[PDB]
Amino acid sequence: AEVTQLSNGIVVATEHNPSAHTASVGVVFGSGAANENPYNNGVSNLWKNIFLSKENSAVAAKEGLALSSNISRDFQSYIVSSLPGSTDKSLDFLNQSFIQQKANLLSSSNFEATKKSVLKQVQDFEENDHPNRVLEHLHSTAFQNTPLSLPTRGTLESLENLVVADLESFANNHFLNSNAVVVGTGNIKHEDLVNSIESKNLSLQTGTKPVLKKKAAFLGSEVRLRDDTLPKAWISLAVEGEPVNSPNYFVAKLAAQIFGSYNAFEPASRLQGIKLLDNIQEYQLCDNFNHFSLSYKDSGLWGFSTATRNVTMIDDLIHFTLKQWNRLTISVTDTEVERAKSLLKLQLGQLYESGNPVNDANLLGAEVLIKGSKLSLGEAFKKIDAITVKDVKAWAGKRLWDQDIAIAGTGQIEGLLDYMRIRSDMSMMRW
């Protein structure tokens, strides 16, 4: 596809697809959980559910409109969807919710029922969803005392002390035209969207959001949440990685694809060309693992997550996995690098060429907000095809060899050994 950006006072981006049967229109702001403090942690999660509340959604469903929203660390989104010949109504609804009249939504009755609904989501998350809350605690110890540590949903202790005035203060400082991108995906022409905006003289708020004092800093650390009543052990482990607008962005993504993802109960996942699986399958040390490479405006993370029921062989799983990471600096084969090139292109093709216009609106707005434009998928494939074996060794010797780590765990983790027995496995030194 082909993107098209403009600036008439308002930044308008679009990605037309004539094959789609729908159209999405929305606005993406360049502020998220990393632009908050510990006192108001969760105020962006309440704006999501106030936008999706029942009396607001009822007004939309009478004209054939569906609503969505998403809160992350670096951005926030508010999307409206419609049939292709009804995109003029999508913009009017968005006009009387952000540019005008966001006081009818913050009434007393609408704010108390919404608050009670959010306190029950975050409570069930902390007691039932173990893989995702251990990955949240990883961000909280790795980036402690910096903005990138705060959870995106909020906490139960900070949510209870939020009143209406906290919602209005956060909007005056962040929902600004200088911090906003208007997006359009699916079956919508680029020129029909901009002329519709020019015929209304819209302006959210002018600009100059706050300054954000501290930068993100990685600290080697651990946090353990032991619970012997649960039936598994959930563990995550990472080093410091690459931010966006880094030269090593795609080299870190390719090195995670070398070790990849595993499911013990799927037969075809046991046959992948991954050397680590010859050690794990002898005694069945885990149920699943997945390797990630996450990237933000200021820093990143590189590592893996696992879940297991073999609570007596945890130390052999962590040991064998970290000995394969060492091979990226010493001994990594040309065959392993060509496999990972092909599967990474398939992974990026499914993410960017899905059918949903709502997913494409979130990717487009976040990219334009953070580098001014969007890289094509044909240009990204050429960068991936130009990575050599020497490039992987240079990246790993800087980022992996003899470097500090962050750890988080929950469940039956008595068998997870101390920090320094694990820190020592990051360098071979039988060498």
Partner 1 sequence: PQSFTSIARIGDYILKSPVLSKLCVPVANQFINLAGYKKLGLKFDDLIAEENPIMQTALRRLPEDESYARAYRIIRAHQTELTHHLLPRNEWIKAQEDVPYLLPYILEAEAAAKEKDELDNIEVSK
Partner 2 sequence: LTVSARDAPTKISTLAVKVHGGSRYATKDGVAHLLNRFNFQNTNTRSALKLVRESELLGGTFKSTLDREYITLKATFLKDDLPYYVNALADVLYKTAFKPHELTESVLPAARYDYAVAEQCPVKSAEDQLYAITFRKGLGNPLLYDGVERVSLQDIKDFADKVYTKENLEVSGENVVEADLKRFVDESLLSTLPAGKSLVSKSEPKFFLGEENRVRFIGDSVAAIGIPVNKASLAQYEVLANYLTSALSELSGLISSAKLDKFTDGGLFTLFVRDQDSAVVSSNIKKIVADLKKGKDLSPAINYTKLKNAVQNESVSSPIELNFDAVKDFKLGKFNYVAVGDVSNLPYLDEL
Partner 3 sequence: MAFRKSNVYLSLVNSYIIDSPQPSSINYWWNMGSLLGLCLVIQIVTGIFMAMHYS
Over the window 272 to 291, marking each residue x when it contacts partner 1 by CB under 8 A and - when it does not, the resulting string is: -x-x----------------
Tokens of 303: 């590592």
Q: Is 338 a binder of partner 1 (CB under 8 A)?
A: yes
Give the one residue of 2, 124, 127, 334 binding partner 1; rule: CB under 8 A: 334
Q: Is 9 a binder of partner 2 (CB under 8 A)?
A: no
Burial class for 100, CB neighbours closer than 10 Å (0-12, 13-18, 19+): exposed
Considering CB distances under 5 to 8 angstroms, the limit depending on partner class, which of partner 2, partner 3, partner 1, none binds residue 334?
partner 1
Q: Is 19 a binder of partner 2 (CB under 8 A)?
A: yes
Nearest to 104 by CA among 95, 96, 92, 112: 96
What minimum distance in Å lies between the beta carbon of 339 and partner 2?
Answer: 5
Q: For residue 87, what are the CA distances in angstroms to 184, 225, 268, 354, 356?
A: 10, 49, 44, 21, 16
Please list the residues that pair with 260 across neighbouring strands: none
Contact by Cβ (8 Å): 344, 305? no
Measured CA to CA, the distance from residue 388 to residue 411 in angstroms comes to: 41
Over the window 276 to 315, marking each residue x when it contacts partner 2 by CB under 8 A and - when it does not, the resulting string is: ----------------------------------------
Residue 382 CA, chain-centre distance (Å), reads 25
Give the one residue of 14, 16, 22, 253 binding partner 2; rule: CB under 8 A: 22
Considering CB distances under 5 to 8 angstroms, the limit depending on partner class, which of partner 2, partner 1, partner 3, none binds residue 160?
none
Phi-psi domain of 68 (left: phi exceeds 0; alpha: psi -120 through 50; beta: other): beta
What minimum distance in Å lies between the beta carbon of 115 and partner 2?
Answer: 16
Nearer to partner 3, 166 or 425 (CB): 425
Angle among Cα 302, 240, 375 to the nearest 5 degrees reads: 65
Give the one residue of 9, 38, 207, 349 binding partner 2; rule: CB under 8 A: 349
- Stretch of 85-93, 256-264, 333-341, 404-412 lying at the interface with partner 1 (CB under 8 A): 333-341
Q: Is 379 a binder of partner 1 (CB under 8 A)?
A: no
